[PDB]
Amino acid sequence: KNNFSKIRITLASPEEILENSFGEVLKPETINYRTYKPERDGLFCERIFGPVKDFECHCGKYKRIRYRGIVCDRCGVEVTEKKVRRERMGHIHLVVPVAHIWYFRSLPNKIGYLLGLPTKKLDAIIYYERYVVIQPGVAEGLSQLDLLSEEEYLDKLDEIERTHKGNQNLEDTNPDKFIAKIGAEAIYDLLCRVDLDSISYELRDRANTDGSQQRKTEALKRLQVVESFRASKGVNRPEWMVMKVIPVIPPDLRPLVPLDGGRFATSDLNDLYRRVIIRNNRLKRLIEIKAPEVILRNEKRMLQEAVDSLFDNSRKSSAVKSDNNRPLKSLSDSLKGKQGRFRQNLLGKRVDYSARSVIVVGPELKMHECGLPKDMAAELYKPFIIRKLIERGIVKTVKSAKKIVDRKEPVIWDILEYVMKGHPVLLNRAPTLHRLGIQAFQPKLIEGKAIQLHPLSCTAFNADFDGDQMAVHLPLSNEAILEAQLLMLASHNILNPANGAPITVPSQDMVLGLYYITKLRPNTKGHGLIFYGPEEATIAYNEGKVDIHAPIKVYVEDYENGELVRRMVETSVGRLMVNEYVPKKVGYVNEVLGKKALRDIIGSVIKICGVATTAKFLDDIKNLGYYMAFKGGLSFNLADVLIPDEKDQLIQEGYTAVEQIMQDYSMGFITFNERYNQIIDTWTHINGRLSNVLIKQLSSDNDGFNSVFMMMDSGARGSKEQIRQLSGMRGLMAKPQKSGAEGGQIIENPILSNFKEGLSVLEYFISTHGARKGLADTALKTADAGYLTRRLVDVSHDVIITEEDCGTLRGLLTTELKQNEDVVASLYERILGRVSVHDIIHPTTGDIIVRAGEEIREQAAQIIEDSPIEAVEIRSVLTCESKKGVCAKCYGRNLATNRMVQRGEVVGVIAAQSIGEPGTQLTTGGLPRVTELFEARNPSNPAIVSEIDGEIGFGKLKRGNREITVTSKLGEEKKYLIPLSKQLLVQENDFVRAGTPLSDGAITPADILAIKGPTAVQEYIVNEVQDVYRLQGVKINDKHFEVIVRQMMRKVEIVDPGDTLFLEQQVVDKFEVMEENDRIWGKKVVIDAGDSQVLKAGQIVTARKLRDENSMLKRKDLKIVKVRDAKSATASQILQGITRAALQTKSFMSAASFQETTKVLNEAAICGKTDYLEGLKENVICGHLIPAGTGLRDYEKLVVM
Amino acid sequence: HARSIGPYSLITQQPLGGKAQFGGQRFGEMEVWALEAFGASHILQEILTVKSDDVVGRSKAYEAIVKGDPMPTPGIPESLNVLLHELKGLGLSFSLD
Amino acid sequence: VPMDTITRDMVRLSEDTENVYETVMIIAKRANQIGQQMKQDLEKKLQDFSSSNDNLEEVFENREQIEISRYYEHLPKPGLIATAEYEQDKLYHRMPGATSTND
Amino acid sequence: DLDENGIVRIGAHIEPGDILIGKITPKGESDPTPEEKLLRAIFGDKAGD
Secondary structure (H helix, E strand, C coil), rough: CCCCEEECCCCCCCCCCCCCEEEEEECCCCCEEECCCCCCCCCCCHHHHHHCCCCCCCCCCCCCCCCCCCCCCCCEEECCHHHHHCCCEEEEEEECCCCCCHHHHHCHHHHHHHHHHHHHHHHHHHCCCCEEEEECCCCCCCCCEEECCCCCCHHHHHCCCCCCCCCCCCCCCCCCCCEEECCHHHHHHHHHHHCCCCHHHHHHHHHHHHHHHHHHHHHHHHHHHHHHHHHCCCCHHHHHHCCCCCEECCCCCCEEHHHHHHHHEECHHHHHHHHHHHHHHHHHHHHHHCCCCHHHHHHHHHHHHHHHHHHHHCCCCCCCCCCCCCCCCHHHHHHHCCCCCCCCCCCCCCCEEECCEEECCCCCCCCEEEEEEEHHHHHCCHHHHHEEEEEECCCCCCHHHHHHHHHCCCCCCCCEEEEEEEECCEEEECCCCHHHHHEEEEEEEEECCCCCCCCCCCHCCCCCCCCCEEEECCCCCCHHHHHHHHCHHHHHEEEEECCCCCCCCCCHHHHHHHHHHHCCCCCCCCCCCCCCCCHHHHHHHHHHCCCCCEEEEEEEEECCCCCCEEEEEEEEEEHHHCCCCCCCCCCCCCCCCCCCHHHHHHHHHHHHCCHHHHHHHHHHHHHHHHHHHHHHCCCCCHHHHCHHHHHHHHHHHHHHHHHHHHHHHHHCCCCCHHHHHHHHHHHHHHHHHHHHHHHHHHCCCCCCHHHHHHHHCCCCCCCCHHHHHHHHEECCCCCCCCCCCCCCCCCCCCEEECCCCCCHHHHHHHHHHHHHHHHHHHHHHHHHHHHHHHHHHHCCCCCCCCCCCCCCCEEEEHHHCECCEEEECCCCHHHHCEECCCCCCCCCCCCHHHHHHHCHHHHHHHHHCCCCCCEEEEEECCCCCCCCCCHHHHHCCCCCCCCHHHHHCCCCHHHHHHHHHHCCCCCCHHHHHHHHHHHHCCCCCEECCCCCCCCCCCCCCCEEEEECCCCCCCCCCCCEEEECCCCCCCCCCCEECCCCCCCCCHHHHHHHHHCHHHHHHHHHHHHHHHHHHHHHHCCHHHHHHHHHHHCCCCCEEEEEEEECCCCCCCCHHHHHHHHCCCCCCCCCCCCCCCCCCCCCCCCCCCCCEEEEEECCCCCCCCCCCCCCCCCEEEECCCCCHHHHHCCCCHHHHHHHHHCCCCHHHHHHHHHHEECCCCHHHHHHCCCCCCCHHHHHCCCCCCCCC | CCECCCCCCCCCCCCCCCCCCCEEEECHHHHHHHHCCCCCCCHHHHHHHCCCCCCHHHHHHHHHHHHHHCCCCCCCCCCHHHHHHHHHHCCCCCCCC | CCCCCCCCCCCCHHHHCCCCCHHHHHHHHHHHHHHHHHHHHHHHHHHHCCCCCCCCCCCCCCHHHHHHHHHHHHCCHHHHHHHHHHHCCCCCCCCCCCCCCCC | CEEECCEECCCCCCCCCCCCCCCCCCCCCCCCCCCCHHHHCCCCCCCCC
């Protein structure tokens, strides 16, 4: 089967091995490569590895699929498909016992703690170089644990000789055999014949009594190891650790083939197995004959080294070659390939129903359609077409269907037309930044070989039409297509998840056409008459009795909040034509319809009536303004651009002023730099006085049209600067000098010629200078922004919110922030969309504004802003009580729709993307400060807090640092240590408060942490990043960011863990286990006097000993209840960095594909843990449906199917 | 270039591309995160299981779509089969629970 | 009620159905069952219709079997039907395994 | 489009997939049973490894 969860790991016994192995490898060679024939019983052995190709043996007796179930006589091979080769094992049976490397390279080697030996000492006993007492018996004076090498056997034996009675007079029936060994066999027998439960209880007793620091510390580490072993009852007994027999890998993952040059491409692991096997063979040859003990020692130690190297080499000092050293690649390193293997291509993939081609602008399609060349559509949808030909009945074979769909002869495309109509397609950008780079669409046939795409969607892709080569995908499963046309489809995706801005603000040409329609000219066709609104206006325009545009008076209906006034407005056909389309819930539109106003209107209509409505509005305004812009026939000409006559005057005039300031500096009274300053000032003055007169003259020539004037003023494209160049001086340009200089100081003489007249050679040279300077600057800035983007996108990854309410009637006191000169961030967006706490009323009496637990609305928000209320209490994703998530009502507005966030949707990755992407514009700011604040690093510029309160009184000064205590009505004068080179915000007679910073620089998380709480530290850093992102002119609502900080408050440090390591400074998110489990789960049975029934391993019977000799040696526990302490689990929350916070995640696949597989697999296989797969990243890797979206509800909710 | 079904590699059950042989596009990490951001129910699962890297599953799904059963039966990718095989177990304790 | 397949734009499902995503899935189930029933009905009755002969040439001998096939091929795909069932809201959803009002 | 010399003659149009250069090589590098070489090289189609 394949459906799985709830996976467990353990260590198996040698006996279960060879069940899946078809035989031992008895021929040490790898493969007969000089004949290219398979090697029997070799590293490439068909007999043990099954068929080497589908339905064949190594001798070629069988070579075809017809041989189902037959067996080759020569080789023990099933003659079936090649697949079965990838599962069966073989084995290598090692002659000498061998000790496992992985235990040894562990810092807490479980053998080391259990037996209690010096590391190198046990290394020696394994490596045969020394002996050690293993089972002495009645040994004269040497204990079981002495360290000793030579001549002890001589003395003990020649003193002891008594009789041969204990099975060679040794301590299996009878002691008096002082016996010693070297490593593997001794530890084997010791572990297999030892018990530790009484050891555990005496560890309890000594931890009650013995030496506190060293003895208790190390022996409680030992206690961890032993009770982790004992915690298993399908027990992982240490007996299994011996690697007596090691299975062998199929050649299927270790291919071999002769390439050019007489060389075969084979895995280094194959060579390693070859070497290990051949050294085992030399062990056989040098031991089976009665060789001296030295030969046996050398061979056995060499074999131990060989197998250790095979399983994980390079641990000992490796060969160094400066250019690129190539040691033999290992098996473990191909297991622990985090970014070599397990990161990019483990997830990045090929795809099989995709296509790729170039895109072109669509001026006819709707917002939910796309143009699709005939062959791409003829090919992606091919299987569906194949079925529909099948259901035709005209075809019976998919081969014939392929024959007819490939050559594409004069038969029906009707099926492509149909299927294309309800089977949307996913359009896919290459460098997807935030989700609005992936959408679905309804596809549509067009002519040619290009992808037609609607003009107003590309801004979501943030692309240009240079010729890019967008990708397309086909879902193939109806659940997927439903998700597509229900959530993916573009019409529903009109908002910016970053913040409430609209995404599809229309472009230059539509805004130009709309600006064209709605001007106001005084006297034209049909001035001053009367209408009824629609009918009379459309008639009088449609018969040329009035032009498109003339001030007319008309009788129209608009709502006064929000009713129903119908008056005589003065307006123009045109504005009437468009306002035929503004929905009948806002009233009537009377302004010159720029870009600013267009965004205002689209916002108001969305906020008043919702998504589908505002979509239809935007589509139709597109179409009409776009046609009108065309029929107006707008173009550009030289006569359009009038240079001002006075420019020839004005440019001249400044010269004489320049002349004087020349002669002034000629007489030298004026400094050179201030000469520079004065001349640049004068030339800037003349630049401005030319530019403004230019623009006004541009306006007034028709007031109805000047291609440049309307292209500028309507905000289609352009600026005052560009147009000034097109008709006035180029301005000033910088003297950069490009190297070792700031640039800065600029040329004394401006580039006075404008692009109209042409440029002299030198000026054009200076322009090339500056322009390529700017291009180089842009290139380097893009390079700089790339690293910020990649890292800060790699900040975070996490799990979802999970409850409909969070009960925590203890929310934040939210107010508006003003930074010491004015207000820069409003409460309006700070309050908007966030559930409220207590019903609020206006100071004007008797007007309930909100009901508790209601979605605050924009109208309500405006009313509140108008009201003289100062702050309000609302919930914070922080204060959520609900563990393993956040409550629905905790968070608030969805920001993608405009609704309350609903159950089941992942907020975290959204917050990540939205907070990372503006980094590309992010230009101390930048990556440094951001990562400094996330990753809990010291500011290196030591700012601290006052941590107490009082009224400031200046003490002694001038030490190079300032020992100052403010004051304390409490009674303290503890002295702080801010160095003098640190700016201080402290002034005499002021009243400081506890936790108040006193010095410049960033406050360490510890100060505010300890003296103010996680809420305080989180709000501090939220404010800080919001400040910087605001200073870089990018708007982000704090919610996203506030999610991230939550993950970093989750950690505690435990100071008094009486019943665990006392150093498990674990995550306070795992705060439940702190007292609930209490090693005994709340001391429910910490008692022996009545009954415990678990510690009955003591001689417990009523017998005046369950009732008078109360139960055991310590009458109850003789000092305190079983612990020598009450067992508090005292702890204090401590902040951490995002990187480490990720590192301390609790899951074995999660960490294993994160960092250091060895440590985590060690701890896990030690603990024998089971994992139920109930994680996001974990289940991503396992290739099942993730525990979000689906995986909260409809993870249940599956019967009926 | 485009492709629906094509020749299969001999080192992995992934069909390569490049218009030398059609193949497909790199379904990279970032669109994995995008289908993460919204609730990809079967989109992401079929992308990483049957759309790619399951020649057996791909053949079955193809034959089903042409044979009239659009309901898939996604199983376990070889990447996890490789995971059990390459971890190498030891004395082997994989799970059946 | 005729659908004449288009792309759908929804807030109404937030009225009758408590959550968007659960709504998606239940529509998915209903679409599944509708598709299964249509596919079985079509396959049985068509294989009954063409039981006389299954050759490539013989299927087109009257043009009317093709006509009925393309008529049903002119019918909307199951997901459209399920969606339309929720704008008509003839179905009700509850805890696991909600089913149509067909009884 | 191929000539009798195993190559496409000059003077033809090419639809994708058709032969360009005819290269057929009895490379008996399958020292594991070249009797397969002979066996399928005597069938007439002479795939014969």
